[PDB]
Coordinates of C-alpha atoms in Angstrom, one line a residue:
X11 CA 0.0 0.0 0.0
X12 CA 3.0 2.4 0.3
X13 CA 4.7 4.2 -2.4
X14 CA 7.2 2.2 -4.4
X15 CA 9.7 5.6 -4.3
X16 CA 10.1 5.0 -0.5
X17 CA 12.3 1.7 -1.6
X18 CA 15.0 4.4 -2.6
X19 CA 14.0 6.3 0.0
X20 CA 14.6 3.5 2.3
X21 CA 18.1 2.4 0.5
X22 CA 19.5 6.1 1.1
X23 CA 18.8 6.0 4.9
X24 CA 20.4 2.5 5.1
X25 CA 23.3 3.8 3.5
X26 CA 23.8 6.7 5.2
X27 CA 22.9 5.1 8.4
X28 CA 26.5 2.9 7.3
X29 CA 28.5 5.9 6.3
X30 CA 27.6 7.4 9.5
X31 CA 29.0 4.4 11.2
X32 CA 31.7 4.1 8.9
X33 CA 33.1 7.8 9.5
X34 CA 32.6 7.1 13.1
X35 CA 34.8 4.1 13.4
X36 CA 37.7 5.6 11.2
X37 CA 37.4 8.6 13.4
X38 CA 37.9 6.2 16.5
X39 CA 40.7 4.2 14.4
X40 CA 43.1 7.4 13.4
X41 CA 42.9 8.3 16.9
X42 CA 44.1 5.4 18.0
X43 CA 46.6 5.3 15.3
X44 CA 47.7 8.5 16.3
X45 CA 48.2 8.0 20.4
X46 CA 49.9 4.8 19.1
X47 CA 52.4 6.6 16.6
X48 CA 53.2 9.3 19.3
X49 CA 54.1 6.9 22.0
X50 CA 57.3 7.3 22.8
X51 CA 57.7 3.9 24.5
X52 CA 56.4 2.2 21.6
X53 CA 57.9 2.8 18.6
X54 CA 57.5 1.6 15.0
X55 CA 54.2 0.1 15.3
X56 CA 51.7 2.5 13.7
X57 CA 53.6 4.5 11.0
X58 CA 53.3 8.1 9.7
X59 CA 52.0 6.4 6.4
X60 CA 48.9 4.5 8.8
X61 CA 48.3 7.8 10.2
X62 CA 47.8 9.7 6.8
X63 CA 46.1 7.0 5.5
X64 CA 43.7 7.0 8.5
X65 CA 42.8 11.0 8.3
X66 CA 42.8 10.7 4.8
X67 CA 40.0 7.9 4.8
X68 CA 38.5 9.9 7.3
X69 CA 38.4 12.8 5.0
X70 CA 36.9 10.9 2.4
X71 CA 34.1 9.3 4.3
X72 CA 32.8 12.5 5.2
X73 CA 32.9 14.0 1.7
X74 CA 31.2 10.8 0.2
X75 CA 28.6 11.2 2.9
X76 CA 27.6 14.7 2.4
X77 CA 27.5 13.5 -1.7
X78 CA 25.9 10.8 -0.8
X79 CA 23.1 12.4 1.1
X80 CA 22.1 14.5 -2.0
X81 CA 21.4 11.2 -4.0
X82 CA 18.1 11.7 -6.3
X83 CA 15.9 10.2 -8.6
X84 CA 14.8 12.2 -11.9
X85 CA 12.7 11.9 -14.4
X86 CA 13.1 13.7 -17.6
X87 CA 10.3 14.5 -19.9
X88 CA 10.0 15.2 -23.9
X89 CA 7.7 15.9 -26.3
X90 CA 5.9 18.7 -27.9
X91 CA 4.4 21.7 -25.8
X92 CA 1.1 20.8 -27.0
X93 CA 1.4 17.3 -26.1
X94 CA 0.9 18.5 -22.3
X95 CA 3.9 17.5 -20.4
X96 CA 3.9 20.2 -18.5
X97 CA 0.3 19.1 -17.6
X98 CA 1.5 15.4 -16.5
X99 CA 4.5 17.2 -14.3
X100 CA 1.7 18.8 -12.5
X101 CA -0.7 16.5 -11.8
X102 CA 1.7 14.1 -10.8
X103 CA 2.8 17.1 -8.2
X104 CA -0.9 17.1 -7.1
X105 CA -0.6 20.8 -8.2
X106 CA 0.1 23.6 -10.7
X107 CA 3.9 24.0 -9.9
X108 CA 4.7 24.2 -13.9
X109 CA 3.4 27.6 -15.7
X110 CA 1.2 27.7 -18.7
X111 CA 1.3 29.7 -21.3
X112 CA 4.7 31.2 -21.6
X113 CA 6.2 30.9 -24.8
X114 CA 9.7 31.8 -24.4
X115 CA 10.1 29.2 -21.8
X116 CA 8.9 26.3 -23.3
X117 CA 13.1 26.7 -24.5
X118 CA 14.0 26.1 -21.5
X119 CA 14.5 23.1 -19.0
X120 CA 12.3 23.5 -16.2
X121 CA 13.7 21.5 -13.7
X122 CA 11.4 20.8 -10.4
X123 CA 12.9 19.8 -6.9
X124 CA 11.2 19.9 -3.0
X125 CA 12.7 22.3 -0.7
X126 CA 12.3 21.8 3.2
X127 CA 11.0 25.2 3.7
X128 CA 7.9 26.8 3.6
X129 CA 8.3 29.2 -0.1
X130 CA 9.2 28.2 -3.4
X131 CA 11.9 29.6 -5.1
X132 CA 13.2 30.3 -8.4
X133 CA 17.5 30.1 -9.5
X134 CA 18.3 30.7 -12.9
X135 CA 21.1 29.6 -15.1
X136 CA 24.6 31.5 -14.5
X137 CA 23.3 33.4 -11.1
X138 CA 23.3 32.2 -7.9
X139 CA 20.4 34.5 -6.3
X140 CA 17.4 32.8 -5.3
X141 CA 14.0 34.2 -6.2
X142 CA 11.5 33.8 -3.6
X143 CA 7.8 33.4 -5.0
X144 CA 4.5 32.4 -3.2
X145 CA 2.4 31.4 -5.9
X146 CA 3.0 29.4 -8.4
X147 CA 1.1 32.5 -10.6
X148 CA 4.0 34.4 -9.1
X149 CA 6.3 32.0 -10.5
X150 CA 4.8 32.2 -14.0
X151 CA 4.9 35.9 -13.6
X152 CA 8.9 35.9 -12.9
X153 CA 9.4 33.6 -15.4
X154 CA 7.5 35.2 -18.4
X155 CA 9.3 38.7 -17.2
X156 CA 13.0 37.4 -17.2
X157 CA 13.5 37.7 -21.4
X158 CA 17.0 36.8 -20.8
X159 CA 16.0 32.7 -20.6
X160 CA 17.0 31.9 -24.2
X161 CA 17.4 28.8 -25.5
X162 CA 18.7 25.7 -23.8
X163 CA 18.9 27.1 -20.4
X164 CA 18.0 25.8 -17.3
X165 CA 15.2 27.0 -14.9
X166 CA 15.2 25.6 -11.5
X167 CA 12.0 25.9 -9.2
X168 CA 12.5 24.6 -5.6
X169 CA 8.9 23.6 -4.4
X170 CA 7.7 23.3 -0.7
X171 CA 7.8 19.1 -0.1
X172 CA 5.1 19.3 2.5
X173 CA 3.1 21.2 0.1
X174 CA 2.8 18.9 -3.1
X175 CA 3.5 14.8 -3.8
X176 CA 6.7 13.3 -4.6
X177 CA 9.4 15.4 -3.8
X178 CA 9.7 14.9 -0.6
X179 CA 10.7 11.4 -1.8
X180 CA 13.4 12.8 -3.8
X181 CA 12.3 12.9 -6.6
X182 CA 13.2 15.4 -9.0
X183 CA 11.1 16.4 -12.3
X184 CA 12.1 17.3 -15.7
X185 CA 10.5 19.2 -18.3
X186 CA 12.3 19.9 -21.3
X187 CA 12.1 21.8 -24.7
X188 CA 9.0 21.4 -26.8
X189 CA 10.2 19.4 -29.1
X190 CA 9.1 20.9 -33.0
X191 CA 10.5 20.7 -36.2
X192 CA 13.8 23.4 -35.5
X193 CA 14.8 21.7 -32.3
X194 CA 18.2 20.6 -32.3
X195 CA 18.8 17.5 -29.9
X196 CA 22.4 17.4 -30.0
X197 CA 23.3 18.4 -26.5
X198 CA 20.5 17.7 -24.5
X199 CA 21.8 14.0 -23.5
X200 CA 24.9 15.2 -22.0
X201 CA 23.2 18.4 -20.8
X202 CA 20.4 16.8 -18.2
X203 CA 20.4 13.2 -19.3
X204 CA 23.1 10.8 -18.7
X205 CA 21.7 11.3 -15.2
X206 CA 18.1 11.1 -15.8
X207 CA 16.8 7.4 -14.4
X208 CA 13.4 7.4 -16.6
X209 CA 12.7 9.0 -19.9
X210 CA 9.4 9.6 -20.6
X211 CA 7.7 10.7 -24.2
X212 CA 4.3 13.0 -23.8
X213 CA 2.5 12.6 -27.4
X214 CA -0.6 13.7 -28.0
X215 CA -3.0 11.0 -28.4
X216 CA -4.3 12.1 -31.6
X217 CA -1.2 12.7 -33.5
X218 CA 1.4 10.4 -34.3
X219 CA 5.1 10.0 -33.4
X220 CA 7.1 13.2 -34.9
X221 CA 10.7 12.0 -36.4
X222 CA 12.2 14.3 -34.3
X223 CA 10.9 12.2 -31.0
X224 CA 11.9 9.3 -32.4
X225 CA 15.2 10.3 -33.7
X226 CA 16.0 11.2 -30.2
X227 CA 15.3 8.2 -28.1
X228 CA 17.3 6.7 -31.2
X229 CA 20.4 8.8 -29.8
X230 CA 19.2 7.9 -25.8
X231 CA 18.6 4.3 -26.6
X232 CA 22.6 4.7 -28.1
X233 CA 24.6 6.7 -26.1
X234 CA 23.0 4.4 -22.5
X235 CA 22.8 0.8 -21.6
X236 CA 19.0 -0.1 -21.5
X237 CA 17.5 3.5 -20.4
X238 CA 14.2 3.4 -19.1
X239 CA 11.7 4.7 -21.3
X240 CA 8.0 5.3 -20.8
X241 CA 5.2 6.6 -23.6
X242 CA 2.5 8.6 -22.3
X243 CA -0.5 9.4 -25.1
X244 CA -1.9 12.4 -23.7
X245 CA -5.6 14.0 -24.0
X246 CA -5.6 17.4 -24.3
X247 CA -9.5 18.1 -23.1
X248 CA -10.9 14.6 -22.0
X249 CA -14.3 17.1 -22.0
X250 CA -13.9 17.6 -25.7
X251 CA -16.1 14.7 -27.5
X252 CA -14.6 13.3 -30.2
X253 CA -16.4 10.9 -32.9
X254 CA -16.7 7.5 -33.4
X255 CA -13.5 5.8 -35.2
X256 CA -10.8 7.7 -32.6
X257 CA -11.1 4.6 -30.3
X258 CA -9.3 2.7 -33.6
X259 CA -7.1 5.8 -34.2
X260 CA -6.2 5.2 -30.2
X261 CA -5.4 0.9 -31.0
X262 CA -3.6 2.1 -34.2
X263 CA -1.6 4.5 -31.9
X264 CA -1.0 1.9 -29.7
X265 CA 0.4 -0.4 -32.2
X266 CA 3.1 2.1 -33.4
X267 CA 3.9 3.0 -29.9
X268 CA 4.8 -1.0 -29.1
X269 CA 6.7 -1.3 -32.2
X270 CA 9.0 1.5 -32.0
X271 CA 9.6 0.1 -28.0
X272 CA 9.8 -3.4 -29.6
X273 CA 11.0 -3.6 -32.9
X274 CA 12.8 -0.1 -33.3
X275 CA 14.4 0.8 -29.8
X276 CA 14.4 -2.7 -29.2
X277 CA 14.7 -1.3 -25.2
X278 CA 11.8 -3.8 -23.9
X279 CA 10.1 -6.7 -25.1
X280 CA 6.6 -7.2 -26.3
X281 CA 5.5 -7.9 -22.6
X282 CA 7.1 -5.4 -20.9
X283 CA 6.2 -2.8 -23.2
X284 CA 2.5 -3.4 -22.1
X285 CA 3.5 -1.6 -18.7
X286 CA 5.4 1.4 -20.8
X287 CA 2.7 3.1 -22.7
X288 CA 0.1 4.4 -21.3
X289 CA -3.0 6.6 -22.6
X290 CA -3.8 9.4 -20.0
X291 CA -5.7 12.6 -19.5
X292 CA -3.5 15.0 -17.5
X293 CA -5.6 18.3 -17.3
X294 CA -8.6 16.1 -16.4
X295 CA -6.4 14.3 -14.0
X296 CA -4.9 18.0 -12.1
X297 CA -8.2 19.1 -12.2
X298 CA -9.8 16.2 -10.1
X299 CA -6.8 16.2 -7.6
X300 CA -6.9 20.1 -7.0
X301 CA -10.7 19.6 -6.1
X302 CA -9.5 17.0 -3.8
X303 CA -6.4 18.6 -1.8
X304 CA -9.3 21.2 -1.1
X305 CA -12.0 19.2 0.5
X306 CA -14.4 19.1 -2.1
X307 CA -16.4 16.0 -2.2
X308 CA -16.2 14.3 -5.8
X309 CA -19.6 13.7 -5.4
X310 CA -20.4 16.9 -6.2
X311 CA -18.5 17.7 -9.2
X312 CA -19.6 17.3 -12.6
X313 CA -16.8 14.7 -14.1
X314 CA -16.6 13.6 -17.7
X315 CA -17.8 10.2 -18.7
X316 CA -15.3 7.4 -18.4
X317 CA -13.4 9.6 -15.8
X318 CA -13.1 6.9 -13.3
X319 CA -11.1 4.6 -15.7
X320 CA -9.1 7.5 -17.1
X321 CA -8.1 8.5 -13.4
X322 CA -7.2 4.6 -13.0
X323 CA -5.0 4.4 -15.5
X324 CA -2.8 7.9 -14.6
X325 CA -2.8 5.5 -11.1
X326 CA -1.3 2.8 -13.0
X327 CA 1.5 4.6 -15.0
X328 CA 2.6 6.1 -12.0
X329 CA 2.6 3.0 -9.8
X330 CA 4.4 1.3 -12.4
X331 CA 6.9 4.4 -13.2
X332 CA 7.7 4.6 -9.3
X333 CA 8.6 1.2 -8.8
X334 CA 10.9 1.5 -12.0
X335 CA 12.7 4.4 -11.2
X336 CA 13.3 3.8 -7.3
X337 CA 14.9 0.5 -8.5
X338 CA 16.6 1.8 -11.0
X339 CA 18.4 4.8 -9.3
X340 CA 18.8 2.7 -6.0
X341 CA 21.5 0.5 -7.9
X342 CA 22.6 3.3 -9.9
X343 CA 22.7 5.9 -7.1
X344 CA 24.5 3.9 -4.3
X345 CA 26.1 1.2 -5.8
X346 CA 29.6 2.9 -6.6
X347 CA 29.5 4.4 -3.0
X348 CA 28.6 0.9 -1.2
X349 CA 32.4 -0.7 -3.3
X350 CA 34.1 2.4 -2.1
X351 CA 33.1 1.7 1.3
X352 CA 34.0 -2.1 1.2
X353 CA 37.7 -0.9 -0.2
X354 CA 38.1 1.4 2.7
X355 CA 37.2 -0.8 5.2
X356 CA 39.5 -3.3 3.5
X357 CA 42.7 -0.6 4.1
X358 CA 41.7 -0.1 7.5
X359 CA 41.5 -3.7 8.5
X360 CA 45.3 -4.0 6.9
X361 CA 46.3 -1.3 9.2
X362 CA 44.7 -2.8 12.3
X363 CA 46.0 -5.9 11.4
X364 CA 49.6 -4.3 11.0
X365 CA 49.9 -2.2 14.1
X366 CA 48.7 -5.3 16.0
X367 CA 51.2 -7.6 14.3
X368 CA 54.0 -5.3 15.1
X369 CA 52.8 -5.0 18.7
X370 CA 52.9 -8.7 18.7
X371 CA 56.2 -8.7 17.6
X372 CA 57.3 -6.2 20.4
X373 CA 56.4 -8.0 23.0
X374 CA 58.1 -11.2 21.9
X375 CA 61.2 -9.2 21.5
X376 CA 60.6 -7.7 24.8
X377 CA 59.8 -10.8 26.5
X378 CA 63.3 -12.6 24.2
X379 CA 65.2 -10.0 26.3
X380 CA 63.5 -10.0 29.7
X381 CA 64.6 -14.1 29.8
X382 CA 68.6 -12.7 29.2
X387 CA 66.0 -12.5 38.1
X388 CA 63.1 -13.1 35.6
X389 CA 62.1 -9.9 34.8
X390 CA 59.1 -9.0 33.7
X391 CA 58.8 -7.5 29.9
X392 CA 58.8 -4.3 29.7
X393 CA 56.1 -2.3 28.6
X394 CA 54.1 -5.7 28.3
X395 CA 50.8 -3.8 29.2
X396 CA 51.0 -1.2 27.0
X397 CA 51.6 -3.5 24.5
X398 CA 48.6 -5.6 25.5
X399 CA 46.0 -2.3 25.1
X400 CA 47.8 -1.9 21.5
X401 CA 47.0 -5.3 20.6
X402 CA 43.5 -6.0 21.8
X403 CA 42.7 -2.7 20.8
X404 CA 43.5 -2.9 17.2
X405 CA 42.1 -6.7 17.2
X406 CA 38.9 -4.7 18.7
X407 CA 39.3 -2.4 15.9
X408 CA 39.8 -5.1 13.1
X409 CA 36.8 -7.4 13.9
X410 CA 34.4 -4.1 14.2
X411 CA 35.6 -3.5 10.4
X412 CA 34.4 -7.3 9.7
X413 CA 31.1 -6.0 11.2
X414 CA 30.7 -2.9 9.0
X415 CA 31.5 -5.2 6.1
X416 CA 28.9 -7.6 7.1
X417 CA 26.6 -4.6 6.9
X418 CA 27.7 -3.3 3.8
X419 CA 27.1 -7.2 2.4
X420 CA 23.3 -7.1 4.0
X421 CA 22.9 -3.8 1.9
X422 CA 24.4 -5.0 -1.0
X423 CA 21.7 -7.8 -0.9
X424 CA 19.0 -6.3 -0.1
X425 CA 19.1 -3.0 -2.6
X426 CA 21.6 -4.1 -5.2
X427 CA 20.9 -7.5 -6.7
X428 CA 22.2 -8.8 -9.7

């Protein structure tokens, strides 16, 4: 019954939960490499090189944890601006976050992201100032003012997470340039792409696939490994009737949707390209959830017929689209982290292991000379802290990796 994005939410607080306990065992380790190394009774048993190595690791933990706690999902979205994309962003959001109307933007990436605060703001490409704006009609107002937003840029629009749906499960949403006949596609895969964890095509239902489209998820489908892809077929106004043979124009539309999935892209097999297209009416669908977040009772509205299976099916593509992407971006989101973490932890344990071996070695060189009365070795109890400690030391690094093997298996199978 719960969201399928709370799996990655639920993979990043296990692996932060580790990194936290990571940092704070290294920090416990280089101190005691350090008191060790300083000792002037002991001597060559923890190096300058252990201690480095220690801070250094120490160093690095930290830095991959503060990256590591900015790990996010995104979704990009393509297709022309009267296709409606902007329109699935937003009732996906629960809410018009994405502006209407504005030409000169639909250039532009929008990107959308939650802030933990209670206003939205607005940062634009190149500046670093962040426009406050309480409205999302004030946000369409800043952006259709600022003429400077020419082509290609990037508009990002921080959103209140308590005040919409799924980004507070970070999630982040992408709408990009209305694709048309003078678009030029060349840099948008390496401009907000090889980091987006679903594509998703917005066509209108009525009109068929534009060369352009394709053409594109042809240069996706090539420059990644098996990229997710999703088709949405968008109604414009469900309200608007239509006649009689647009239920076959819809089943023909379907058929050229599977093969360019199937036969074309060749992403996704016949079966699994039943759960990637999906036929949706997003104005209709934005509409019926504003009504909702405001208390009004559905049973008072005036819906359009069919409305109940239109709304099911939005419910199905994004069931299905969450439980791809938060599987997807768990394994490619964490996955280099969790190794690094198993290699650290595999330096440590060598230097635990070394510092204990040369205290071993000390006290069987002090115990060698103590036998030439029968004294007793010098230093032997020092010795004996420096050797259980680091033993201590070396079998909580077994733990961690037994923890970082019990993530490994339960968020990154093969």
């Amino acid at each position: 019954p719960v969201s399928p994005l709370k799996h990655f939410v639920l993979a990043k607080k296990a692996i932060t939960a580790i990194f936290d306990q990571l940092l704070e065992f290294v920090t416990e380790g280089s101190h005691f490499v350090e008191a060790t190394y300083k000792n002037p009774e002991l001597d060559r048993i923890a190096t300058e090189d252990d201690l480095v190595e220690m801070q250094g690791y120490k160093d690095k933990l930290s830095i991959i944890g503060e990256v590591l706690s900015r790990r996010h999902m995104k979704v990009a979205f393509f297709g022309r601006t009267s296709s409606g994309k902007s329109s699935v962003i937003n009732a996906m959001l629960w809410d018009k976050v994405l502006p209407s109307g504005i030409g000169h933007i639909t250039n532009c990436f929008l990107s959308v992201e939650g802030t933990d605060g209670d206003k939205a703001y607005l940062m634009t490409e190149g500046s670093d100032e962040k426009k406050s704006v309480k409205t999302v009609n004030q946000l369409a107002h800043a952006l259709h003012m600022d003429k400077d937003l020419k082509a290609g840029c990037l508009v990002r629009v921080f959103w209140p997470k308590a005040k919409c749906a799924l980004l507070r499960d970070d999630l982040v949403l992408v709408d990009s340039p209305g694709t048309d006949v003078t678009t030029e596609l060349d840099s948008w895969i390496d401009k907000f792409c090889l980091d987006a964890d679903v594509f998703v095509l917005v066509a209108n239902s009525e009109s068929t696939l534009m060369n352009t489209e394709k053409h594109f998820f042809h240069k996706v489908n090539e420059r990644l490994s098996k990229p997710n892809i999703f088709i949405l077929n968008n109604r414009w106004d469900a309200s608007a009737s239509e006649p009689e043979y647009m239920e076959d124009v819809r089943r023909q539309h379907m058929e050229r949707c599977l093969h360019f999935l199937v036969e074309e892209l060749k992403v996704v097999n016949a079966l699994e390209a039943q759960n990637r297209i999906f036929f949706v009416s997003a104005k209709e669908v934005l509409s019926a959830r504003k009504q909702k977040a405001q208390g009004m009772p559905e049973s008072g509205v005036a819906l359009a017929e069919g409305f109940h299976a239109r709304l099911q099916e939005f419910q199905n593509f994004e069931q299905i689209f969450e439980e791809c992407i938060s599987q997807s971006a768990v394994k490619t989101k964490f996955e280099q982290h969790t190794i690094r973490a198993k290699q650290i932890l595999a330096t440590v344990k060598n230097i635990m292991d070394s510092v204990n071996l040369a205290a071993e070695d000390k006290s069987a060189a002090s115990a060698a000379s103590a036998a030439s009365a029968a004294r007793l070795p010098k230093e032997i109890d020092q010795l004996e802290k420096i050797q259980n400690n680091s033993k201590l030391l070396r079998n909580k690094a077994v733990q961690l990796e037994n923890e970082l093997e019990n993530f490994t298996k339960q968020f990154l199978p093969s």
